[PDB]
Ligand binder design. Structure first.
Ligand SMILES: Cc1cccc(Cc2nn(C(C)(C)C)c3ncnc(N)c23)c1
Length: 241
């Protein structure tokens, strides 16, 4: 429609801007440098924990969508807020992402790149899935291209380590190659400092060798929503978590 007004340049890769749709609705605008399938997907998928597609400009997109004021989750955890987040806030954020992926799961879709960098945050610690990497990719997916919702579950397990480490890169010290050789031999990341074994157990369930044995995003959602009542009712704050 071309009723957009770009104000602040958010990031650069294409680019992303904070603008205003027809002089009112504040929106985010992703731009392509000539040298989009995401929009096609966001037409079918509509959920409160998924970033909302608003409009498109197929000439010169300019993909317009819901503006998330706190940028990516990766930047959020590595930012000034990281030091104040505790398990309750982190688990909560995990539950919201499981809710979005639960919807994806029911819609028979696959993300193929779930991770903190592709999660957006807003006010009141609202998290939503967006953007519809060996360290984040399930073995069967990275090796044989077996991309399913179960390979997204594996990726969610890695995302859990990102939350509990507050942004740190998975498999610290290991390069892609070592990560492939190691994970194939049954290696799995240890329990993060001050992270309850119960949560690390959830990760390991997401990392099971057999895809069909990994839990559903429905199970993950429910588990995380009830965490501090059914699982760790005796939880006590710590230095970092
Ligand atoms: C649909 C759509 C449109 C524009 C941008 C995105 C992804 C996105 N990316 N970014 C970054 C963090 C600037 C890269 C966003 N910041 C705020 N709101 C957003 N929606 C984003 C998605």
């Amino acid at each position: 429609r071309e009723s957009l007004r770009l104000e602040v340049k958010l990031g650069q890769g294409g680019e992303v801007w904070m603008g205003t749709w027809n002089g009112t609705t504040r929106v985010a605008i992703k731009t392509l440098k000539p040298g989009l399938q995401e929009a096609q997907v966001m037409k079918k998928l509509r959920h409160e924990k998924l970033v909302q597609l608003y409009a498109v400009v197929s000439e010169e997109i300019y993909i317009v969508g819901e503006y998330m004021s706190k940028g990516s989750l990766l930047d959020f955890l590595k930012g000034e807020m990281g030091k104040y987040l505790r398990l309750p806030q982190l688990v909560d954020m995990a539950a919201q992402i499981a809710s979005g992926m639960a919807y994806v799961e029911r819609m028979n879709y696959v993300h193929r790149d779930l991770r903190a960098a592709n999660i957006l945050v807003g006010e009141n610690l609202v998290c939503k899935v967006a953007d519809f990497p060996i360290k984040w990719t399930a073995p069967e997916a990275a090796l044989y291209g077996r991309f399913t919702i179960k390979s997204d579950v594996w990726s969610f397990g890695i995302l859990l380590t990102e939350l509990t480490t507050k942004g740190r890169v998975p498999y610290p010290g290991m390069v892609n190659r070592e990560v492939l050789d190691q994970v194939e031999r049954g290696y799995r990341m240890p329990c993060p400092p001050e992270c309850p074994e119960s949560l690390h157990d959830l990760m390991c369930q997401c990392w099971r060798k057999d895809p069909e044995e990994r839990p559903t995003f429905e199970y993950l959602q429910a588990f995380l929503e009830d965490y501090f009542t059914s699982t760790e009712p005796q939880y006590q704050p710590g230095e970092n978590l």
